[PDB]
Design a protein around this ligand. Structure first.
Ligand SMILES: CC(C)S[C@@H]1O[C@H](CO)[C@H](O)[C@H](O)[C@H]1O
Ligand SMILES: [Mg+2]
Ligand SMILES: [Mg+2]
Ligand code: NA
Ligand code: NA
Ligand code: NA
Lengths: 1014, 210
């Protein structure tokens, strides 16, 4: 064992490991099997185990096999030992966490010694077979039972199983598991995620009779219109063949048996040597079957009884059966005859506390959120999941892409292993043992060959293996250019909608162009798109406009579901979110582990609502009085949906109402609105419709909003002049300052800087920092890309801004004059922002303070055409006032940006100040709200047509601080008011991704604001 | 009512600045009680004899997007040459300007008119920073056409040969101009990005004699 070094041999991926197979419970009562109640023959060995850590496997003492070590501790299993503090988790993306020297791993290979003293019931050893199942061990392990070696296993994401029947004694028993952190297996586990290890999934003991169901496959085929099905169940036995032996496969819907078949063993003749005498295929006819889909996850129950002809049950197995067809026809992925539109998301198995250990609660939590936010599909990025995941997806209704635990991203070139026949054995085990495990789950609709491992001949062989073994499911794979011969689906990652990215060998064509390349017929579903890293998902709507226009663009899987942040603690025992490099870990890829639509604790990022809106299942058109509602549901009718409409003038409700939605799948409903009441005052009428689900479901609460849309109706422009003012403001001129006085209000303009330096209400200052122009933002993740202090990327927006000096450019005053008028004082200014002799921006302003006490600020900016386009064109100032609430008439309520505002609605919004800050773990520009016409904060009111954000953090603190928890609330409130703001992008987070139409490139910019106290 | 919309004055004040005079105005174009467009303007005339016109326009969102947001007038002058710094030499519109080049152009006044057999808007040149005609110079960032033919005469005349040179020179200077379309000629074919849909529009001119 010490001598062999099997963890450094891709030829040895297991020793004495049993065959893979679908979930077994070995029920000895049919009814228990039918109802899926716990099985006395399936014991869990989860809980308190004994664990010790070692620098290498050589440093594991001989005594540990026979005796528990005193140094060892009592830990909970399943667990990742990094999460218990024993060593550091490593976050790396591409570059391997170990030296690239296949198949060799580091001599210093962290070794986790697990042990358990447990009882085996006598009954279990008198008859039948007792096996141990390790659902997840990262990354390789040797197993001993009662001091005797049992076997070895690799592949972190599939169960390893061993027969312990001859190793177990009655009474107390002891398992010894030596878990290696790195193995030849590691070379195929280079996923972009936290690198951890240990026994991290369930450990259990299964008892099976000596004569047993060893394997079983369920299949369902249909007639042309799905009105008749045939369930086909292949069952294989182990043990002695006997004439009295039978299998009954019976199909239940609730408590009704709908079909049943019983046959002896011995299948049809297969070749010249006969057939499988140890197998039987059962064929059941089902009339008018209830079809399975994510829309309506109709399940049947299938119970497979192994028994004597005379009626003695030997054992029962079972699975949920979902009657559905998955085929690709004429270039379209069809489910039950209908073209799918995949509203998907990639989801790693991550928990901020427990690491890579999963639990029902978290999984259920994830499914509900996904379904509540209009997702219908998930990708198992990039390994087979905890077995409960599929059960839940079967039951709640989600399309799953099941992915082999193969990623060799770090290799050079990416297919160095996958094109090497010597790695085919290791690879095949990762594909084949997956298929054997999950093939009966209806929620799995697509098989994937892994992730980011180039395209090698090994992929082609495995592709064909699956197509041969399971015709029911298309096979996809992205490596080597996303459209190789190893994929039934064009599945690129981060291909853009309109923009070609013609990388050599592996181009990412615009998805619209990709479909029509000469000879191409396949459907396109993006395996990864819209990289939700930090403040992101800009341009998301553009994907969905395309998905809907093009039949063969059948959607994609967002990257990704949840931030991979871990929980650390400070001096005071206060929790904070940690990313790459926060564990002494190096080389690291810092915050690249947080691309989630939700935080590690499952709190939504702002972007989640944008996804929810774009992935709506009802589309709307307006034509005068008529709302046309179109259903994008393929199967269900809108039987738990009513339309809630509201007409509002500038946030003020006028008319409302409800209509029940009665829409057939893919059908249309015309809702005729009543004659609307005439709005008195001036303003813009907005119509808002919402789709509300009256009844609670398995996945949502009563009143859950599933879709919404807005339209501008009538606008009555204000023509009424404000009534003339008695008072006239007084200019108090100085060498250094222009003061303007009216009532208790006082305005000061510094004649050396050119900016409003101060305002007074009564005799209290309102500003801590003068009102100045701003052309920069605290850079987003998308602004940064793969840019770091040691490796400069000159093309990332932040570097373009930096090199051009946007951040360090000083305002030179060109002009600052004062004029008194009939009813107003007029301050005129001009500033030039220069860096090293170049003039980047000229800002020409006028400040018109009149008798009403309302300062009308007019701003016109020239931006030099050869300077990189600025992040924003606006003003900032630090206010002295700190209010509890922020109130505005604009897009909201949540954070929105120019290329991410479709989900925001125009209305009157009122939130606490803290909600106006988005706590991105890597702090940046955040909290912006667009199309705002009025902003209120304490005694202040601004009016116009602007974008804004308001917080206790400066753009300077946001860009100088690496983690959210290190931010300190500054004195007063920083306000950012922008006439214009650059898009956030996020088609990926490693190249500039902001589309041309969201870049501030017009050259000349104009916006006007009205500042008044109310 | 875009074609019979009457201008209704809302504000018209003057102020003497330190070194200039400022004329602030506000207009509403109305039809059947509906305000279509509001035009807010400042005219600033300083010692150099330069008239800086600042125009801010509101367009009601529920009115069809207008053909142009600009200014016009009939000049008494009739010159032989038109000289401009902008896209040219030929007629160009926002959705048909890729062939035009930015440069100093000098054409006879006739060339600034396109003789389409059925008369319409014509002769426009876009992205113009300076226009010279006789004594006059206009500066900013605008589009313009310049001819002996008013919009009114063009739209009322069926054939080009029935056209008569009016007295003086009709000038149209647009801050913004709607696309011309053409994907077909039997349904709206002007793309969204070339429709004047923003709701609020700003442009600025400088007028002076040279
Ligand atoms: C950084 C790119 C060169 S690779 C890029 O990294 C991303 C980071 O979240 C994801 O892991 C993507 O799958 C991968 O293509
Ligand atoms: Mg090995
Ligand atoms: Mg990768
Ligand atoms: Na489609
Ligand atoms: Na990542
Ligand atoms: Na930062």
């Amino acid at each position: 064992v010490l001598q062999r070094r099997d963890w450094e041999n891709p030829g040895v991926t297991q020793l004495n490991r049993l065959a893979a197979h679908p979930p077994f419970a070995s029920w000895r009562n049919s009814e228990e099997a039918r109802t899926d109640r716990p099985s006395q023959q399936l014991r869990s060995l989860n809980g308190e185990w004994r664990f010790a850590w070692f620098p290498a496997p050589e440093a594991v003492p001989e005594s540990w096999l026979e005796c528990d070590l005193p140094e060892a501790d009592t830990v909970v299993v399943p667990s990742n030992w990094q999460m218990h503090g024993y060593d550091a988790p490593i976050y790396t993306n591409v570059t391997y966490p170990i030296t690239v020297n296949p198949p060799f791993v580091p001599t210093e290979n962290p070794t986790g010694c697990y042990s358990l003293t447990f009882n085996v019931d006598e009954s279990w050893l008198q008859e039948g077979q007792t096996r141990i199942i390790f659902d997840g061990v990262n990354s390789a392990f040797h197993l001993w039972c009662n001091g005797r070696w049992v076997g070895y296993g690799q592949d972190s994401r599939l169960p390893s199983e061993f027969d312990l029947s001859a190793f177990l004694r009655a009474g107390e028993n002891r398992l010894a598991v030596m878990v290696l952190r790195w193995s030849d297996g590691s070379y195929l586990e280079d996923q972009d995620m936290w690198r951890m290890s240990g026994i991290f999934r369930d450990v259990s003991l299964l008892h099976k009779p000596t004569t047993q169901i060893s394997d079983f496959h369920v299949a369902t085929r249909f007639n042309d219109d799905f009105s008749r099905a045939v369930l086909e169940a292949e069952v294989q036995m182990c043990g002695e063949l006997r004439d009295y032996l039978r299998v009954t496969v019976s199909l239940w819907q609730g408590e009704t048996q709908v079909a049943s078949g019983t046959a002896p063993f011995g299948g049809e003749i297969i070749d010249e040597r006969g057939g499988y005498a140890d197998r039987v295929t059962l064929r059941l006819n089902v009339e008018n079957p209830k079809l399975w889909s994510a829309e309506i996850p109709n399940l049947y129950r299938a119970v497979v009884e192994l028994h004597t002809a005379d009626g003695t049950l030997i054992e029962a197995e079972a699975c949920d059966v979902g009657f559905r067809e998955v085929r690709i026809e004429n270039g379209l992925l069809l489910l039950n005859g209908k073209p799918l539109l995949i509203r998907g998301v990639n989801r790693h198995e991550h928990h901020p506390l427990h690491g890579q250990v999963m639990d029902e609660q978290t999984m259920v939590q994830d499914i509900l959120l996904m379904k509540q936010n209009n997702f219908n599909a998930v990708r198992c990025s990039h390994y087979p999941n905890h077995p409960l995941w599929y059960t839940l997806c079967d039951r709640y209704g989600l399309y799953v892409v099941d992915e082999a635990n193969i990623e060799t991203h770090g290799m050079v070139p990416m297919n160095r292993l996958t094109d090497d026949p010597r790695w085919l054995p290791a690879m095949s085990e990762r594909v084949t043992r997956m298929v054997q495990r999950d093939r009966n789950h209806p929620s799995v609709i697509i098989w994937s060959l892994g992730n980011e491992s180039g395209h090698g001949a090994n992929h082609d062989a495995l592709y064909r293996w699956i197509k041969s073994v399971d015709p029911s499911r298309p096979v996809q794979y992205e490596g080597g250019g996303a459209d190789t011969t190893a994929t039934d689906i064009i599945c690129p990652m981060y291909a853009r909608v309109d923009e070609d990215q013609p990388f050599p060998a592996v181009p990412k064509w615009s998805i619209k162009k990709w479909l029509s390349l000469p000879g191409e017929t396949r459907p396109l579903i993006l395996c990864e798109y819209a990289h939700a890293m930090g403040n992101s998902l800009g341009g998301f709507a553009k994907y969905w406009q395309a998905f809907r226009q093009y039949p063969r663009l059948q959607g994609g899987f967002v990257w990704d579901w949840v931030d991979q942040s871990l929980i650390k603690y400070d001096e005071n025992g206060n929790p904070w979110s940690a990313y790459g490099g926060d564990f002494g870990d190096t080389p690291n890829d810092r915050q690249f582990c947080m691309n989630g639509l939700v935080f590690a604790d499952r709190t939504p990022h702002p972007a989640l609502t944008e996804a929810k809106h774009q992935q709506q299942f009802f589309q709307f058109r307006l034509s005068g009085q008529t709302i046309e509602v179109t259903s994008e549901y393929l199967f269900r009718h809108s039987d738990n949906e009513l339309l809630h409409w509201m007409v509002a003038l500038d946030g003020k409700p006028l008319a409302s109402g409800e209509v029940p939605l009665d829409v057939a799948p893919q059908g249309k409903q015309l809702i005729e609105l009543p004659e609307l009441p005439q709005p008195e005052s001036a303003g813009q009428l907005w119509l808002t419709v919402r789709v509300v689900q009256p009844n609670a479901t398995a996945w949502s609460e009563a009143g859950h909003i599933s879709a919404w849309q807005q339209w501008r109706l009538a606008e009555n422009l204000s023509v009424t002049l404000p009534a003339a003012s008695h008072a006239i403001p007084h200019l108090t001129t100085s060498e250094m300052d222009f003061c303007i006085e009216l009532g208790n209000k006082r305005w000061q303009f510094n004649r050396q800087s050119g900016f409003l330096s101060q305002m007074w209400i009564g005799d209290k200052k309102q500003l801590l920092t003068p009102l100045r122009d701003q052309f920069t933002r605290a850079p987003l993740d998308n602004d940064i890309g793969v840019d770091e202090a040691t490796r400069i990327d000159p093309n990332a927006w932040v570097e373009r801004w930096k090199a051009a000096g946007h951040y360090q450019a000083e305002a030179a005053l060109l002009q600052c004059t004062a004029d008194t008028l009939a009813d107003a004082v007029l301050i005129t200014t001009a500033h030039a922002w220069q860096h090293q002799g170049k003039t980047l921006f000229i800002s020409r302003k006028t400040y018109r303070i009149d008798g009403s006490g309302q300062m009308a600020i007019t701003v016109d900016v020239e931006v030099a055409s050869d300077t990189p386009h600025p992040a924003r064109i606006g003003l900032n100032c630090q206010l002295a006032q700190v209010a509890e609430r922020v109130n505005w008439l604009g897009l909201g309520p949540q954070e929105n940006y120019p290329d991410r505002l479709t989900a925001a609605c125009f209305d009157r919004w009122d939130l606490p100040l803290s909600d106006m800050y988005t706590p991105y773990v890597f702090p940046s520009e955040n909290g912006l709200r667009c199309g705002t016409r009025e902003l209120n904060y304490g005694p202040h009111q601004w009016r116009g047509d602007f974008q804004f954000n308001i917080s206790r953090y400066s753009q300077q603190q946001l860009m100088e601080t690496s983690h959210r928890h290190l931010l300190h609330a500054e004195e007063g409130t920083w306000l950012n008011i922008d006439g214009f703001h650059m898009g956030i992008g996020g088609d990926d987070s490693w190249s500039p991704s902001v589309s041309a139409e969201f870049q501030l490139s017009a050259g000349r910019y104009h916006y006007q604001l009205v500042w008044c106290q109310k």
